[PDB]
Amino acid sequence: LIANQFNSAIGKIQDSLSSTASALGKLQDVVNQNAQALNTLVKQLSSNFGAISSVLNDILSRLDPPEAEVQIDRLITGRLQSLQTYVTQQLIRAAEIRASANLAATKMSECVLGQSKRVDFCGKGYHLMSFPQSAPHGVVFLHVTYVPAQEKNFTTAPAICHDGKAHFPREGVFVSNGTHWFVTQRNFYEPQIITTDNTFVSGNCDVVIGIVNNTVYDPLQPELDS
Amino acid sequence: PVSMTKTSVDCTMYICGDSTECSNLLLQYGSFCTQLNRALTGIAVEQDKNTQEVFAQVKQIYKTPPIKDFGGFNFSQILPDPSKSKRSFIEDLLFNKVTKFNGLTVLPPLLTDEMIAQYTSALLAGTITSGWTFGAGAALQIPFAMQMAYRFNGIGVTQNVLYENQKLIANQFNSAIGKIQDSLSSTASALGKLQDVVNQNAQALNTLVKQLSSNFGAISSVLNDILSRLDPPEAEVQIDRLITGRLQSLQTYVTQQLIRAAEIRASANLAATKMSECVLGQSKRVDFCGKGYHLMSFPQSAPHGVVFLHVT
Amino acid sequence: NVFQTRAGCLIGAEHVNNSYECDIPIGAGICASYQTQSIIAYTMSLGAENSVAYSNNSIAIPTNFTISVTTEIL
Ligand SMILES: *[C@@H]1O[C@H](CO)[C@@H](O[C@@H]2O[C@H](CO)[C@@H](O)[C@H](O)[C@H]2NC(C)=O)[C@H](O)[C@H]1NC(C)=O
Ligand SMILES: *[C@@H]1O[C@H](CO)[C@@H](O[C@@H]2O[C@H](CO)[C@@H](O)[C@H](O)[C@H]2NC(C)=O)[C@H](O)[C@H]1NC(C)=O
Ligand SMILES: *[C@@H]1O[C@H](CO)[C@@H](O[C@@H]2O[C@H](CO)[C@@H](O)[C@H](O)[C@H]2NC(C)=O)[C@H](O)[C@H]1NC(C)=O
Numbered sequence: 308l309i310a311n312q313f314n315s316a317i318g319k320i321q322d323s324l325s326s327t328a329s330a331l332g333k334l335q336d337v338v339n340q341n342a343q344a345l346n347t348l349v350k351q352l353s354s355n356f357g358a359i360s361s362v363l364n365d366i367l368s369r370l371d372p373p374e375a376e377v378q379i380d381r382l383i384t385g386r387l388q389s390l391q392t393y394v395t396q397q398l399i400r401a402a403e404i405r406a407s408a409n410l411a412a413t414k415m416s417e418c419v420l421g422q423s424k425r426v427d428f429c430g431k432g433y434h435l436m437s438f439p440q441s442a443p444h445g446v447v448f449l450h451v452t453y454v455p456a457q458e459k460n461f462t463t464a465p466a467i468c469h470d471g472k473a474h475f476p477r478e479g480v481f482v483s484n485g486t487h488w489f490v491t492q493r494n495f496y497e498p499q500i501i502t503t504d505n506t507f508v509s510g511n512c513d514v515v516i517g518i519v520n521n522t523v524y525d526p527l528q529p530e531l532d533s
Numbered sequence: 534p535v536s537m538t539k540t541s542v543d544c545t546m547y548i549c550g551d552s553t554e555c556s557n558l559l560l561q562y563g564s565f566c567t568q569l570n571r572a573l574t575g576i577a578v579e580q581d582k583n584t585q586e587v588f589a590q591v592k593q594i595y596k597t598p599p600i601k602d603f604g605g606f607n608f609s610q611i612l613p614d615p616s617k618s619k620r621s622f623i624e625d626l627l628f629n630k631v632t633k634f635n636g637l638t639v640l641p642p643l644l645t646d647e648m649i650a651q652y653t654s655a656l657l658a659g660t661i662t663s664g665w666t667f668g669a670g671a672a673l674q675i676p677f678a679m680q681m682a683y684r685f686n687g688i689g690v691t692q693n694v695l696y697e698n699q700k701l702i703a704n705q706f707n708s709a710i711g712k713i714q715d716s717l718s719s720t721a722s723a724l725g726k727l728q729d730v731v732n733q734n735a736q737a738l739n740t741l742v743k744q745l746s747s748n749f750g751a752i753s754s755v756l757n758d759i760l761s762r763l764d765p766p767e768a769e770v771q772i773d774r775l776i777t778g779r780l781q782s783l784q785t786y787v788t789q790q791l792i793r794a795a796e797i798r799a800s801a802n803l804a805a806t807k808m809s810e811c812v813l814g815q816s817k818r819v820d821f822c823g824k825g826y827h828l829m830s831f832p833q834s835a836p837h838g839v840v841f842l843h844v845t
Numbered sequence: 846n847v848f849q850t851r852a853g854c855l856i857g858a859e860h861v862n863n864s865y866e867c868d869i870p871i872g873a874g875i876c877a878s879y880q881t882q883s884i885i886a887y888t889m890s891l892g893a894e895n896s897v898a899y900s901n902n903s904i905a906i907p908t909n910f911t912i913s914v915t916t917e918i919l
């Protein structure tokens with residue numbers, strides 16, 4: 308069942324990606340912002356910046372050097388200001404992209420190369436593994452997560468009193484379907500008879516609020532009887 | 534801090550407000566002011582994205598059951614007050630401890646303060662009644678005593694410790710919450726991190742507005758007084774000086790905003806990570822979720838930011 | 846067909862009492878949408894309000910499990 312669910316989920320990733328193109332919005336925004344900054348910088352060449360005309364050859368021709376110098380200097384100031392604005396925008400955008408690249412490095416090194424317990428670091432839910440996939444100017448993970456689906460109620464209790472001694476589960480939780488009591492692991496329903504090989508004793512009944520009454524079976528008694 | 538003030542500035546009405554002559558003359562400078570407007574719009578959208586990432590993490594909107602059976606934990610200071618903007622007591626304390634026409638519009642945030650408070654109250658009720666399963670999947674109810682037993686079992690302490698010292702634990706908890714109340718209401722210097730974001734934005738805007746009233750080397754810092762005194766030829770030289778100056782000032786302010794918004798976005802990413810790995814779970818990352826061994830957390834909203842209560 | 850809000854005034858969209866997820870952000874809670882036809886503007890809803898039956902002795906424990914595979918671009 309698990310392998311079939313995994314294959315079906317991979318196939319769903321295939322379908323989602325192959326159909327809807329709005330999934331790579333981040334990479335597309337990076338490319339679009341860069342292309343827009345570049346086209347703005349280029350279209351800034353066609354500005355007068357206050358001069359008589361943007362064409363440097365036109366200015367150099369139609370004015371004598373003594374005054375064409377001040378015209379060309381005005382154009383220089385304009386174009387240099389535009390270029391410096393572009394370089395500042397690129398510095399800031401590169402800081403942000405490097406933030407995302409450090410984040411991708413961390414995410415790959417923890418998610419892929421290992422298994423991270425950091426909640427919602429590796430996709431909503433409990434984490435199992437995650438395989439990377441390249442992408443133009445980026446990376447794409449497939450965070451294979453584990454999600455629980457079908458649950459019941461199972462009235463519970465913090466501990467049980469067997470011989471006046473309180474018994475807590477070593478690894479699990481006490482539940483009662485409505486008929487008897489059982490101790491099962493916390494994330495998957497798997498009831499088991501309350502034996503002393505699953506729980507441990509501590510103190511007595513005079514402390515634990517909400518304790519209940521039951522008998523914890525012992526495997527040593529039948530082995531002694533037989 | 535999570536978000537800034539969604540400020541927007543109109544290049545034209547700032548630089549050459551109400552002058553077709555100055556507007557036409559500025560038009561010769563190219564796409565400068567369109568560039569500026571697009572940058573400030575990017576910031577303005579990123580603020581709403583920040584708030585979304587931080588708070589809008591829960592799928593549904595959980596709501597605590599009125600029968601407050603929490604093994605002794607009071608929780609009444611952080612759960613919403615149905616008798617106010619339905620916020621909690623400590624959200625209110627955080628509120629009240631935090632304190633022009635040149636195209637300086639100020640867009641409103643997309644998530645109002647009451648919707649923010651509803652989000653953090655959903656997160657809080659989900660935490661209280663279901664531990665971490667609501668962030669891991671579907672919310673599974675579980676008694677708070679058993680939940681804190683799990684958390685105690687997380688840091689290498691057997692459950693019987695809690696199950697025996699429950700009353701002492703609840704007393705220490707509630708006393709600490711009360712201490713938080715007292716501290717926040719008395720020494721209001723605790724919210725410096727948010728108040729300084731607000732002060733930095735206010736001072737940037739004040740410098741930007743002051744710069745309007747400087748000559749930059751022209752004869753009169755009033756565009757209209759220049760227009761109504763000089764010919765087109767000389768007025769063009771004067772207006773050119775003024776435009777150059779004001780545009781350099783506006784570009785400086787927008788670069789400052791871009792840098793500061795990058796810093797705030799770093800802090801909002803950190804707050805999102807902190808909520809995901811701290812509230813919605815229990816992180817074994819030392820000193821990342823409170824100085825000490827970590828038990829849980831409870832988010833509480835604030836003006837332009839978030840505030841946690843790292844129960845360690 | 847005017848409708849004043851906290852972010853401006855929206856010309857050409859009717860105010861609806863309902864509340865669906867935000868479709869086109871507007872400001873200060875309002876969120877436009879296009880539904881049959883006309884354009885509606887309402888106050889966005891944060892999600893299905895879902896209480897939980899929390900007792901002091903009741904629990905919930907999963908029996909089945911799905912293996913989902915999400916995708917995270919960077
Ligand atoms: C579990 O069973 C024990 C004995 O079988 C109960 O112990 C007595 O319970 C009565 C009634 O509450 C008390 O008056 C006595 O003082 C208890 N002790 C003795 C030595 O008789 C115990 O109460 C039961 N617990 C539950 C939850 O049913
Ligand atoms: C949780 O704490 C609040 C605050 O102390 C308690 O409400 C107070 O109750 C006392 C007496 O019951 C009053 O004198 C105060 O005026 C109350 N304060 C407020 C702000 O209402 C509340 O009782 C506590 N909850 C529980 C379950 O004990
Ligand atoms: C463990 O520490 C707690 C808290 O410091 C102690 O509990 C307090 O003890 C003093 C004096 O014994 C009482 O006045 C208080 O009412 C107690 N409760 C609180 C909340 O302060 C406890 O005595 C210490 N020792 C143990 C539990 O063995």
Ligand SMILES: *[C@@H]1O[C@H](CO)[C@@H](O[C@@H]2O[C@H](CO)[C@@H](O)[C@H](O)[C@H]2NC(C)=O)[C@H](O)[C@H]1NC(C)=O
Nearest residue numbers: 308309310311312313315456457908909910911
């Ligand atoms: C867990 O969930 C799976 C998925 O729904 C259940 O398996 C399905 O059972 C129905 C019953 O006819 C089939 O039609 C589906 O094709 C099955 N799907 C898969 C993926 O196996 C399964 O019964 C559930 N319970 C358990 C214990 O696995």
Ligand SMILES: *[C@@H]1O[C@H](CO)[C@@H](O)[C@H](O)[C@H]1NC(C)=O
Nearest residue numbers: 458459460461898903904905
């Ligand atoms: C049992 O759990 C379900 C959740 O699936 C809940 O709706 C129901 O109210 C619970 N039972 C009782 C008696 O509350």
Ligand SMILES: *[C@@H]1O[C@H](CO)[C@@H](O)[C@H](O)[C@H]1NC(C)=O
Nearest residue numbers: 516517518600602900901902
């Ligand atoms: C738990 O809830 C039940 C139902 O209201 C109540 O009778 C009981 O006193 C509570 N406490 C314990 C420890 O069971």
Ligand SMILES: *[C@@H]1O[C@H](CO)[C@@H](O)[C@H](O)[C@H]1NC(C)=O
Nearest residue numbers: 859860861862863864885887
């Ligand atoms: C929406 O609510 C307003 C009052 O808030 C009411 O006047 C109006 O009739 C309602 N319209 C619809 C379509 O429900």
